């Protein structure tokens, strides 16, 4: 078992924060929830801004991880990464340190050719890298305690193009002159319903005869055996009527609405790394067959636009987007960034901090509150602000 | 062994048997049009032409009528048969009955402890999605008591309560020409567009490949002189390409082979959705193709109430015989230049627009095959075209 094995890496915060062990402990405060920002004395590539904050109490540690550095492919390749961990820190810490090496190795297989479109070769490298980061986690499970799982949002800049690769529910948007360019999509039971339902249909042994792949508008009761009810199948976007026939009384594979939706009443996110031994609650059904480490890759050509000082790429974990819409984030960046000197390298760290504070809020008597009395996010929050001007032509 | 229905042409053409026979001319290829004393719903235009030789009969079918649910529902349909004409004929006559029944199930609606609120449009989409399946299930049961060869793609449109519903299962296409704007109302289901679904299924159930097929895709045919050579591949979970050594199973014929619209599943079919094909197999093999096919359509909605449509705003439905030589832009160019030459209230204008489209795809025969503009090869497929004027879909 994994709890008999040593950790592969010690827990920490993003190393580019340059935190001492004492400074890490100050950050893990559930009452203060101190927003950590990147020191002015430690600059990230492209003067990238970073801010983070711990959850409001649900876990003792911040289970987000981040990694940022310039790789060199034997070509330089800028690398930003965000990982949202669950059921432990092991996956997110391992991924935050080893994924960029899988990316570097797969890119070396095609680096000559970069000097079949080339974009499809880069995408292919990222897709193999995610798969090989898994698998390595899978095989090293038997020598190290790589706990839990994590989602992964990464971006690389290779030869004038940004590649945004997502396997989870973090989000990347570009704010280019006030308009929002979405660079990622989320992977959830709602958004992946048909993939999961189809797999449950083609592989019914994965359901352990505790589950049905059909969806219903509500929990089917035994008193409705033989009546007519709306259902939805894997090859349907809409609903039609069916008679309930014993099988439909099994618990549904997908169940719930939005952020309460779940797969086998267990997971609320359907892609990422780790979770190799994760099981359904009170059951011996393995969840991993329904999860995928395959990212969705979206490309942005920085050559085709002349980016100004307030044109930024926002990477953030669901801790931000769960309380702030894309338009709120756009509004916030566009109002804050014109208030800092365009030549100040601390600019985008301050905007990142401003975003976190707008999502964390302030602790009142019945919880954390943001603007207009809304509830503030209780998750870990991590935010990159990447200024796109560092990607301009010449 | 007996035919479920007799072969024919669309009934709204009013053709005698001698006219049907006269139309099936591979050399002349006469463009049949909706006669001007025949009116379709919304004065819809229709025109068609037989292929340039690959089958004795026009394997396209089309069906256009007003369905009753208390509630009326305008219906347009196009079917592209292959490996026979029976599925297309059955579908042309029966799919609307299945659509009617599924809509009758939901027509009255149209007039912690979470409960999902289901929009009325989703009930309509569910009705169309179920109707497509039921039709294919009816073909599957009755194919042992009737000669219902072989298979067909299905594209249909219905207008129910001032919204258009376009359901596509095949490689026919629906676009809207509104002002000059092209509004795609459909997408194609081919080994190219559906590569990952097909690849994932072959991977999860490798017995469907028999033993003559690999589920991996390669940028060319992998040859014997390749073992251990290192070459690019694409798996079901990959949008891009990456390198791989090349082992011995990589030498089997690819599940997907070809490029663009010419790509094929198992060296047999070039479409992956439609009706029929239940006993369709790989040539000189007992590997069955139908596990990879799907009767499930995609459904797209256009809200007629949100735009005041002019006399030349039209919805174009055509089989691939048109789109395989004419782009969306050419069709848009042809429509926007032809229709201003006809009186807006002449009911025959949209039929003439459809004829102009069919003519621009078929071409003219000399000694160098069928030729359209700029000496291009014209389409030798069956071509069938609706031109549906959206002005007659305006509210109030
Ligand atoms: Mg987390
Ligand atoms: Mg989170
Ligand atoms: Mg045909
Ligand atoms: Mg055809």
Residue numbers in the entry:
A (entry chain A): 31 to 104, 142 to 182, 235 to 513
B (entry chain B): 35 to 103, 141 to 182, 229 to 513
Q: Would you copy out the relevant sentences from the publication that reported this structure?
A:
We also introduced a D288A mutation (PPM1HDA) that destabilizes a third metal ion (Mg2+/Mn2+) at the active site. Previous studies of PPM1A (D146A) showed that this variant acts as a substrate‐trapping mutant (Debnath et al, 2018). To grow WT crystals and improve diffraction, a “loop deletion” variant of PPM1H (PPM1H‐LD) was designed to eliminate a flexible and non‐conserved loop (188‐226) that was predicted to be distant from the active site. WT and D288A variants of PPM1H (PPM1HWT‐LD, PPM1HDA‐LD) diffracted to 2.5 Å and 2.6 Å resolution, respectively. The variants PPM1HDA, PPM1HWT‐LD, and PPM1HDA‐LD have identical 3‐D structures with two Mg2+ ions at the active site. However, all of the structures are identical with only minor differences arising from flexible loops and the presence or absence of the third metal ion at the active site. The asymmetric unit in all 4 structures is a dimer that is facilitated by interactions between α3 of the flap domains, as well as contacts between the flap domain (residues 356–360) and α2 of the catalytic domain.
